[PDB]
Design a protein around this ligand. Structure first.
Ligand SMILES: C[Se][C@@H]1O[C@H](CO)[C@@H](O)[C@H](O)[C@H]1NC(C)=O
Length: 168
């Protein structure tokens, strides 16, 4: 079985957090993130992975991963994936991408399926502080497999970047 147990709208990073440092310049480990181990409850052999999608415009790339634009001065490198931050998948493009290959809970037990979103800021144009306002980032959808069914359960949750300030 499967049930939606998380929230539809999720904020990434602490509200009004401040982070200190040729263009572009990359700043923050897992500070600017959202993590929740319990977004769906799954049981009895339900098999499930995750897809992710970023809606922000791509304004460049670094090492195979897109730089997503927020404003003229600030961009973002983004990762989406399973609960643990180290399992994040670097995002590229604006399409749904596989960000967690998946797992199956045992035939006779129960657990939960989680997710995480992480971003690190990139300075694109220098001006001595850069502030960004609350911005929609994208979404993550569960991906049942092995015959498992999404059914009527809510499949998608969204993410918004909480406002932040970058210090020279
Ligand atoms: C460690 Se069990 C279970 O594993 C799945 C797949 O890795 C993860 O998405 C869930 O967040 C986790 N639930 C917990 C920790 O409560």
């Amino acid at each position: 079985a499967v049930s939606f147990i998380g929230s539809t709208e999720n904020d990434v990073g602490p509200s009004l957090g401040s982070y200190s440092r040729n263009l572009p310049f990359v700043y923050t480990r897992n500070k600017i993130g959202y993590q929740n181990a319990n977004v769906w409850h799954i049981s009895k052999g339900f098999c499930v992975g995750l897809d992710g999608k970023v809606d922000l415009p791509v304004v460049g790339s670094l090492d195979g991963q897109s730089i997503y634009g927020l404003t003229e001065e600030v961009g973002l490198l983004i990762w989406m994936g399973d609960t643990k931050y180290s399992r994040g998948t670097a995002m590229s493009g604006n399409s749904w991408e596989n960000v967690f290959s998946g797992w199956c809970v045992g035939a006779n037990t129960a657990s939960t399926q989680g997710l995480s979103v992480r971003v690190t800021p990139v300075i694109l144009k220098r001006n001595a502080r850069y502030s960004v306002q609350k911005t929609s980032i994208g979404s993550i959808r569960m991906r049942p497999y092995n015959g498992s069914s999404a059914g009527s359960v809510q499949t998608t949750v969204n993410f918004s970047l909480n406002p932040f300030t970058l210090n020279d």
